[PDB]
Homo-oligomer: A and B are copies of this chain.
Amino acid sequence: GGYVLG
């Protein structure tokens, strides 16, 4: 799992 923010 993981995430990005932009």
Contacts and interface: CB of A to CB of B under 8 A. Distances in A.
A2 B3 CA distance: 7
Interface string A1-6: 111111
A2 B2 CA distance: 6
A6 to B, nearest CB: 5
Contacts of A1: 1-2, 4-6
Interface of A: 1-6
Given A3-B5, A4-B4, A4-B5, 13 more contacts: A1-B1, A1-B2, A1-B5, A1-B6, A2-B2, A2-B3, A2-B5, A2-B6, A3-B3, A3-B4, A3-B6, A5-B5, A5-B6
